[PDB]
From TrEMBL, chains A, B:
It is found in: Cell membrane. The chain holds residues 48 to 152 of 913 of the full protein. This is Circadian input-output histidine kinase CikA. The lineage of its organism: Bacteria, Bacillati, Chloroflexota, Chloroflexia, Chloroflexales. At low DSF concentrations, interacts with RpfF. FMN binds at N37, R39, Q42, R55, N70, N80, Q101. Residues 62-105 form the PAC domain. Residues 1-61 form the PAS domain. In the N-terminal section; belongs to the phytochrome family.
Length: 105, 105
């Protein structure tokens, strides 16, 4: 099952909702992640270039897909097939971002 | 600000998250809508053909936009500029739906 994260659009994109599969994949409970930027999932072997591409896409509110190395709460690495998209209203304002995670280890 | 509703994908698409502006627009608090299908927003003058189009799009996981008559908690009608999209994983599985409202009354 794939994880889902919803973040606010502004102000460094704090998490506002996660589904159950997010906890299955990452080992974090909702309480442990709400209000935080998702970058706590990264760690020392995460590819910096990939991170850069995410950062640039989010700042532009452009959809992006990447395979990124992430880490469970306990420190166990896993490969995340990650897809992020803005949620826009019909005037084009970005209301949120949604990300989908699949553990492809 | 535009409302946002996230639902599960299956069964009857129960609401799992709403943003602040959903409460502004509709008068409902999160605790009174979570776990319900969004159709409680409809009422006597809602156009049945519009509802039917939403029903078929959700069943097929197709994006759709409609201007639909909805009702606030206090019973006041409002025009909801509604857009719905599925959230998919990279294999195409539907993870959730996202709806965006704008009160265009
Ligand atoms: C909706 C959404 C979901 C995200 N999911 C993840 C994720 O699962 N794993 C991850 O490493 N980064 C994820 N990110 C990316 C980070 O939050 C962050 O944007 C990225 O590391 C680049 O920014 P930075 O250089 O400021 O950290 C997500 C971002 C958003 C907006
Ligand atoms: C994510 C999402 C958001 C929705 N938002 C609304 C809404 O704001 N107003 C509305 O009248 N129906 C909304 N709907 C549609 C109803 O939940 C329902 O699908 C529609 O009435 C058709 O199905 P029915 O004939 O079984 O009621 C939403 C559905 C989804 C999945």
């Amino acid at each position: 099952a794939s994880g889902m994260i919803v973040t606010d659009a502004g102000a460094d994109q704090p998490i506002v909702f996660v589904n159950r599969a997010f906890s299955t994949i990452t080992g974090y409970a909702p309480n442990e992640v709400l209000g935080r930027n998702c970058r706590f999932l990264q760690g020392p072997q995460t590819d910096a270039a990939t991170v850069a591409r995410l950062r640039e896409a989010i700042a532009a509110a452009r959809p992006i897909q990447e395979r990124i190395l992430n880490y469970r709460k306990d420190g166990q690495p896993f490969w995340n097939q990650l897809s992020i998209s803005p949620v826009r209203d019909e005037t084009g304002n970005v209301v949120a971002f949604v990300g989908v995670q699949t553990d492809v280890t």
